[PDB]
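RETRY 2/3 - previous attempt timed out on the joint model. Re-submitting the same 232-residue input unchanged.
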Amino acid sequence: NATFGMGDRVRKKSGAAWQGQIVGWYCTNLTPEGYAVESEAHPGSVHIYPVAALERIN
Amino acid sequence: NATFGMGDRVRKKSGAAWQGQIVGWYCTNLTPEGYAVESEAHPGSVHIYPVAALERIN
Amino acid sequence: NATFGMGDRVRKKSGAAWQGQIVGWYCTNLTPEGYAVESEAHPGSVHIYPVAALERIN
Amino acid sequence: NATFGMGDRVRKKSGAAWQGQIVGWYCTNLTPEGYAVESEAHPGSVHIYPVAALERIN
Ligand code: NA
Ligand code: NA
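RETRY 2/3 succeeded.
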């Protein structure tokens, strides 16, 4: 039931910015659906965010 | 061919410390096999590391 | 007018946990008063947070 | 004796990329001279690095 798949382009909706491709997944009690996103601006740098923080873009 | 699975207890081998359970996975060109690890000391806090940075513990 | 000083013991108030000593400072438009905190559980690992996310403890 | 000052434009020398302005400082035993850098590509997002990881650019 994953919202995003590998390679989707996503951005953070608000606050500190982040944008790039989905490169992984994680799950905790605090964040039952989380994603790893590699920056499209800073190759190799990856952030993890809850699904609710992210939106898919073209 | 994953080295670790969900729930394995791992620690960072050197440098800044980190220890807890595997909670996810990611893959980039820089890090073709990476893991998300939730701290066992700081619930909810998650770091991502390359496989080579981590070792499984009891 | 800094809320915390070097060496203060602080914790994150909510969400993902973090606890340890103040080891630095930063300032952005999003976070005009921010602090670096070295984990007391994971030596060497440092997170940065806005002041509003942190509280001083004994 | 700080290598960089607030507002210097810096980049990470190798590995995962990062580039933007110095916005803060930190010091630990592992990293006796560290800096906070706000991405110029992703406003509001800040990483911390040891001085040896960074170089000043125009
Ligand atoms: Na991380
Ligand atoms: Na950082």
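The interface with chain D takes residues 15-16, 30 of chain B (CB under 8 Å). Closing ticket.
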